[PDB]
């Protein structure tokens, strides 16, 4: 029970990338958890967390994560290392690209979680995002609508970055 990946999905893209990420951590255990099935206290079981949340079709949070969001204040993230990833349409959702993981990070960071895995904005075209931290994304930004050809390279580079951050 090494690394806990908790994701929500609307269409199934975030689920598929959750499996690729799990594969890319070759010598480590990444367990997968749909937050539609999970409780918020399951986050207590891991020191290493990867949070997957798509840019919401409607509102600012994917519905399942939206349900867990109000309960995050019951959990103490002090001492935990937390990485974030999300899918989004940088053209169709240009003013809200990756807002969800930006919102999730702000809360988890205030509860004590330490963010690792910041990701450059080079190669993205968007107007606004809540996931921006000093010119970088708070985590891996994937676009399957417009940049599905970059997804596998990006996941591979990001996981390699995380292994140096997680000490793997």
Curated annotation (Swiss-Prot):
Q: Which UniProt keywords apply?
A: Electron transport, Flavoprotein, FMN, Transport
- Tagged with keyword Oxidoreductase: no
Which residue spans adopt a coiled-coil conformation according to this UniProt entry?
none
GO MF entry, a single one? electron transfer activity
Q: Which species is the source of this protein?
A: Nostoc sp. (strain ATCC 29151 / PCC 7119)
Please give the PANTHER family that the UniProt record associates with this protein. FLAVODOXIN 1, FLAVODOXIN 2
- Domain Flavodoxin-like residues, every copy: 3-163
Cofactors needed by this protein, per the record, are: FMN
Q: Which domain of life is it from?
A: Bacteria
Q: What is this protein called?
A: Flavodoxin
The role this protein plays is: Low-potential electron donor to a number of redox enzymes.
Q: What is the lineage of its organism?
A: Bacteria, Bacillati, Cyanobacteriota, Cyanophyceae, Nostocales
Q: Which gene encodes it?
A: isiB
């Amino acid at each position: 029970k090494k690394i806990g990946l908790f994701y929500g999905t609307q269409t199934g893209k975030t689920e598929s990338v959750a499996e690729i990420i799990r594969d890319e951590f070759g010598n480590d255990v990444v367990t997968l958890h749909d937050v539609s099935q999970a409780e918020v206290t399951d986050l207590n079981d891991y020191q290493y967390l990867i949070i997957g949340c798509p840019t919401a079709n409607i509102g600012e949070l994917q519905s399942d994560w939206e349900g867990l969001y109000s309960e995050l204040d019951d959990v103490d993230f002090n001492g935990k290392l937390v990485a974030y990833f999300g899918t989004g349409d940088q053209i169709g959702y240009a003013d809200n690209f990756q807002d969800a993981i930006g919102i999730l990070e702000e809360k988890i960071s205030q509860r004590g979680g330490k963010t690792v895995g910041y990701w450059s904005t080079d190669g993205y075209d968007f107007n606004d995002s809540k996931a921006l931290r000093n010119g970088k994304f708070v985590g891996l930004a994937l676009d399957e609508d417009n940049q599905s050809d970059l997804t596998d390279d990006r996941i591979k580079s990001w996981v390699a970055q995380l292994k140096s951050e997680f000490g793997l």
